[model samples]
Target: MEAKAIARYVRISPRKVRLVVDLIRGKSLEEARNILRYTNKRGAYFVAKVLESAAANAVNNHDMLEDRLYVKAAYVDEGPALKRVLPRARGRADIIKKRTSHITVILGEK
Candidate 1:
């Protein structure tokens, strides 16, 4: 059995979120939690919550055993970018693209 969780338009760059997702990919639920809890990256916090949500879905919706769950797939994709303007020299404005991410985590029985 498998369970999935997705967090979309998270206010962080996909490049940054990918770094955290890569660490948890193919790891057990417990191991991923530990790694996310102690990791220094900003994206770890978001990734951890999504991981927990996937685990909860497995147990609550799929009747899957918690201890047997492992991360089967974890990936981050670029989301819509929010554009802002920054005042620049000569009274001109520069566009600032604030990136977002759509993160997905899938768990499977081990």
Candidate 2:
């Protein structure tokens, strides 16, 4: 059995979130939480919360054991970028693409 949790339109770059998510893929709950807690990235906190949610769903909704749960799959996808304008010299403007991410975590029994 499996359960998945997604955090969409998170105001973080997909590239940055992927770096944090990759380390926890296929890892047990305790280890994944530990890594997320210590990793010095803003995205780590968001990933950690989503991972916890997935695990909870597995246990509460799917009737799976908490201790036996592991991260079966985790990925970050690029979301629609929020375009903004930046004023420049000579009345020129530059487009600032503030990227977003859709992060998903899948948990399953070991």
Candidate 3:
């Protein structure tokens, strides 16, 4: 059985969040938390919160043993784009694409 959690439309680029999420894809809870605590990236903090939430769901919702939980799957997907204007060299403007991400993680007892 799997206990899962998801956070949608996180206000960061999917590409950036993916870098941190990839590291803890299949890691146990303690290791994943440790990595998150030491990571200096904003994405790390955000993803870590979701990881904790997933663990809580496992315990509360699924009644799974906390110590046995591991990250079964974790990833970030592209979310809505925020388009802004950037000053161009000439009398024009460029579109600045501000990206967002959707983070989803699944945990399970191994």
User: Which structure among the candidates has the greatest lDDT?
Assistant: 1
Please give the ranking of all candidate structures by lDDT, highest first, separated by commas: 1, 2, 3
How high is the lDDT of residue 8 in model 3?
Answer: 85
Write candidate 3's Cα lDDT for 1-110 as tens digits: 89888898788989889999998999999999999999877689899989999999999999999999999999998988999877785777788888889999999889
Tell me the TM-score of model 3. Answer: 0.89
Measured against the true structure, the TM-scores of the candidates, in listed sequence, are 0.95, 0.94, 0.89
lDDT string for model 2 (32-70, tens) is 999999999778989998998998899999999898989
Cα error of candidate 1 at position 101, Å: 0.7
Which candidate ranks first by TM-score, i.e. highest? 1
Instruction: At residue 21, give the lDDT of candidate 3.
Output: 97
Worst 10 residues of 2 by lDDT: 84-93
Q: What is the C-alpha RMSD of each candidate to the true structure, in Å?
A: 1.0, 1.1, 1.6
Candidates 2 and 3, the one with greater TM-score: 2
Candidates' lDDT values, in order? 0.93, 0.93, 0.91
Name the regions of candidate 1 deviating beyond 4 angstroms: none
